[PDB]
Subunit: 338 residues, 4 copies
């Protein structure tokens, strides 16, 4: 029950994974690596958060490169190469790979040479198996050393798509995610040679963007392979995003049957993963929501019994970070006594 | 060729209609009414615009309630009741009804008692006939005294829907407009009892909202009646919006055939109404664009030869205001020698 | 110890006063009046807040115009005229006047005819006596029926000015408040004939504005009468503001002596009113801060031992609302057994 | 009269210098270097600007690394080391150093080894002489090879300070610049270990920041050495900033005398550098303004005849870029026949 975890990349996801982990007893963070964030600086970035407010616990700078958070010691490193991080020195079993620059199996596996046993990439991967809690975590096997928790958008769309497909079938679906800007964007028009639109002033523009999240649902849900795709629109909010899923079902279904199916799943097998609301929600109301997907019943609309537009919110930082921790706890039980 | 026009409601639409009218010779603005905007105040609101920059022409405060703009005199009024506006005193033939509070035929017809001959409501109407330039203006008849130019969103969606339906048929379509906030929204959480979400902080929220624009296309294009609906997402930008149209076609069509059809229309019968671009556009690039609908070829995506997502921009202020003036000029020729 | 309070104007201040009152046992809210907010709508505006997050307690719609919040019944009214509010029917002793349209003694006194005993205007007043907790509340006398809690800015500047003047003397001071936009501003360029700049797009502009807050300090601190003035700059944030006080002292003083004096007061007589920080704060870090004034030691700067620039934050909604409740509790003890 | 100019760093300043240079005949841009911006990408970043709108001229991609802008060929390079840029190959005499990473004389002088004769650093320098057009350009001597155009803020404050000091004397002054965010800031809370506050979410925060601009005025105006300092507040606007100068004069002066002195200079020796307005301006009204400093007469305020707060706007991108070109043209005439 003592799951020792390390974090590589103390950014938005790394710090919010950290914040949720230290406020609970299911997982212990023992080590953090980030070459661009010194230990005293890390304490400040943890204490003060523009999006999620001040850290509630207690923080102390104990030694040169240690922090004491809630009477627990955490060692910090500044290694640019993951192979140089001594995870095994402190008994790190599971590493959260949240840098954004080690998303392939060949790069992420460098944590294993440092003593780590499992690596969980906090992003989609070109070749590592992807998992979405509540959709396909039971397909995990203990022989898998490098895994992916997919993207925030996939974690929003896949639980919803599972409910719709299981109950009424998805013949075809097209998705738009209206998505808050992120750390990859620019404050003013700047270089983004791999994504020209993505370099434009983040808080002044609606910015079309590509995403693999809808195609990735066809990997976590194989029966939907080739039946979903979509795109993204980056808009001037700093956090919280929303999925807009236009799909044609296989069976006739009313919008009230869709609502009831989602509400049923939200209270049953997908409790804590898929939420259901009928309130007049706006994006700030979902800031800090721990679910992966919050279905907005009153925002969607149906054209007919076969063609519907479904709206589901997600805090792209908070919900996804909790899934990382949920995934770590799940595979920790499988690797031991399941 | 001397079309004398009056404007009721010197707001976003009223001032941008005014700005585009006085910078051309097709239409003469002679009178303006707004009880909440005095004449000296009107000069300042015309000169300085947070969205479209400074007025390029010359402005003078000639008398108590007159302005001289580009050597032309414009009289201003402060009447809360449209029937008390003496349009006929200065020969006003066509009135732009841009207050937002006289959108019914029974209310808008009050301008006729003041000497006006035709009223053009700058919004959808519950009962006045709606027109979209490039789609159904030829259905106008000179016996129509009160008419509507529909909404900005309908003026974006209808020209695009006409091209798609004429070439490949629209079996069904679902639309989302990612829309800049407007004057009906609130700076901070405030009362909006007719639209609870619409009262929430405008520049901090993604705000789902209802819209009749997609159903209204079925009125301007009768063959599409009942085949389109949708919703809106208000986001923290001050101007420029974008339509996201997910539709199933009647005939197999590739995305390249869709691009070519739109580009063809943009250079032919819909020139100046429907635009076509392949550039890496973001919303600020369309600020000041005179078209009603700018198709973004590289932002859309197709799932298959029958299911596509189409993206089209519109400056919800500038393009719509030019259509009002285009509509006035068109019906002025019909009412005289067509 | 049972202070029965009513609220007129269920807006930003009215709802945040309400939220802080019901979460404590010093004051009981029993009645609320707002003609533009129905009872079921009031529950939604209380539950969801774009700035301060979701309401933590429990909310129920008990009858036609009653809410049950934390097992306490609150009656709601929709009266445009304060004299028509039956405060005395439910034993309302103190009324929070937070509409913004009854700031004079002659208008605010209308609550007295409805059964209320004291009225506290949540804004500056042209003639009602103004009070700032920690500065001059001891000058209150039980014969005063209509009083003002001044403005948020005055509540930030006055406690700081008191410390500086008491320790080193203020010979002269000039203040700028960089202030979040508020409900009086517009989402896009709109009519504001009493303040032309104030009508311009709120979240796209730095907007100079007038303020009486610095002169008002000379009323709450009479020795500073005529020695302070200033102005405001409205900027695109939805909450939290900061005072920038440039002053010449009467005695030579180093910046470290200023820091120590403020820190001393923050731990002594001004505890809970004036805060002190040396951290690298930005505006969101002060969201929800209960103090009236949080001195930012590392942000200020001194030119010499007589000329200094002092920086102090304030949550213009949260801190001010707590002062209203603090003021009610103080005068309730004076009106009874002091 | 043929001044051949090169640009190092095709960013905000580099592109806006370029845009203003190619639209005039005083200066010819012949070469550009930026390793992170390819030639085809450079054309797109030039054509579309989120802040200053679309480029008005004509752009063509002529060869592999050439652009044709207004029938003029411009060669582009991708060299990380300035010494590897072959400026002399195309006759580049003057180089605009606008990368932000070569601000010292020892680093900026690397352009000289590539064939360049003069280097103009588009920022303050630790050791290169700084110049402000209209204040001290006549102190330039032809033996100076590496020079600085100071910062945008210094270019706003120095012309104003010169007028005040020349007419009434500045005994002491404290400055705050309310400044738009820039490319050095972050879209969301990110690493900024040299400036902790500067890493926080740019468009959601008021962010205190240090600046040397006020002390730098004491270098361009030696008589003011040690009499001015100040700080900055970064706020959520993408462009346009404003200086707030609180100063004590040496002689009694009314605010009307200050207005008249500034207006006089704006029409005389500082024409085109210092502007004067009495209109109800907000920040967007100054977007694209070519002046270095636009005095806002109605926004400032005086406490007494010796203590005043002065407000002056500046487009931190557009005005500063024009000064770079003005400085190049000035020293080009001095280096030849003055
Ligand atoms: N932000 C979101 O909403 C979100 C949601 C889901 C997944 N993700 C994914 O999580 C990853 C991180 O995203 P983010 O928003 O937290 O980014 P971020 O930029 O906020 O954080 C990345 C962190 O990595 C650190 N880092 C950089 N190079 C490093 C190295 N060589 N070794 C160690 N640390 C290094 C940086 O200093 C920074 O602290 C990306 O793959 C992203 O796509 C992001
Ligand atoms: N803003 C857009 O993007 C947009 C686009 C298309 C259509 N429209 C429609 O145009 C109308 C106006 O929209 P807007 O954004 O310009 O609104 P706005 O609030 O900016 O302007 C409305 C104007 O009407 C004036 N007014 C109010 N009552 C009046 C009265 N009794 N008599 C005369 N004038 C009066 C107001 O003072 C204000 O100047 C609405 O119907 C709106 O839906 C708006
Ligand atoms: N917002 C701030 O930061 C702040 C800080 C300190 C003081 N204040 C002062 O508090 C007052 C309210 O400010 P706010 O920001 O809460 O405004 P707001 O517009 O958010 O709220 C005002 C409320 O008054 C209600 N109201 C209007 N007319 C009414 C009437 N006749 N009877 C009853 N209720 C009525 C409105 O429906 C609304 O709910 C103003 O005087 C303001 O200057 C505001
Ligand atoms: N932005 C303003 O308002 C402003 C005003 C006045 C002065 N300045 C100064 O101008 C400089 C640039 O500021 P900016 O806002 O344009 O920054 P920016 O980040 O927008 O542009 C900097 C450019 O430099 C390029 N670059 C980086 N390394 C390079 C290298 N080794 N060789 C060549 N090019 C390289 C980058 O790719 C980028 O295009 C800074 O010194 C800044 O302080 C900025
Ligand atoms: O799946 C992915 O790649 C991401 O989650 C993606 O959907 C978002 O980060 C963004 O909106 C795409 O630009
Ligand atoms: O057609 C309409 O009603 C409007 O144009 C509408 O689409 C927009 O104004 C908004 O996005 C809907 O809330
Ligand atoms: O004292 C006052 O009048 C206000 O508090 C005032 O300072 C602010 O509301 C605003 O910044 C001024 O426009
Ligand atoms: O002079 C300087 O250093 C800069 O111009 C400076 O004033 C601004 O860039 C910013 O507001 C300071 O953080």
């Amino acid at each position: 029950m003592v799951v020792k975890v390390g974090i590589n990349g103390f950014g938005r996801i790394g710090r919010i994974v950290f914040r949720n982990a230290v406020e609970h007893d299911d997982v212990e963070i023992v080590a953090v690596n980030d070459p661009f964030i010194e230990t005293k600086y890390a304490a400040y970035m943890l204490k003060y958060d523009s999006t999620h407010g001040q850290f509630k616990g207690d923080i102390q700078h104990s030694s040169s490169n240690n922090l004491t958070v809630n009477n627990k010691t955490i060692h910090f490193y500044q290694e640019r190469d993951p192979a140089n991080i001594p995870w095994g020195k402190h008994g790190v079993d599971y590493v959260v790979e949240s840098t954004g620059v080690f998303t392939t199996t060949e790069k992420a596996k460098a944590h294993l040479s440092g003593g780590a046993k499992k690596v969980i990439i906090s992003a989609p991967s070109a070749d590592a198996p992807m998992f979405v809690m509540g959709v396909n975590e039971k397909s995990y096997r203990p022989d898998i050393s490098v895994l992916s928790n997919a993207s925030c958008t996939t974690n929003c769309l896949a639980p919803l798509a599972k409910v719709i497909h299981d109950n009424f079938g998805i013949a075809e679906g097209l998705m738009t995610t209206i998505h808050s800007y992120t750390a990859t964007q620019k404050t003013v028009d700047g270089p983004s040679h791999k994504d020209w639109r993505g370099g434009r002033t983040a808080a002044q523009n609606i910015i079309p963007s590509s995403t693999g999240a809808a195609k990735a649902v066809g990997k976590v849900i194989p029966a939907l392979n080739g039946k979903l795709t979509g795109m993204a629109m980056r808009v001037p909010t700093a956090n919280v995003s929303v999925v807009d899923l236009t799909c044609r079902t296989e069976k006739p279904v009313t919008y009230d049957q869709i609502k009831a199916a989602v509400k049923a799943a939200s209270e049953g097998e997908l409790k804590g993963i898929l939420g259901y609301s009928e309130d007049a929600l706006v994006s700030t109301d979902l800031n800090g929501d721990p679910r992966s997907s919050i279905f907005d019943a009153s925002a969607g609309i149906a054209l007919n019994d076969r063609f519907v537009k479904l709206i589901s919110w997600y805090d792209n930082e908070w919900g996804y970070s909790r899934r990382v921790l949920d995934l770590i706890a799940y595979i920790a039980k499988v690797d031991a006594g399941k």
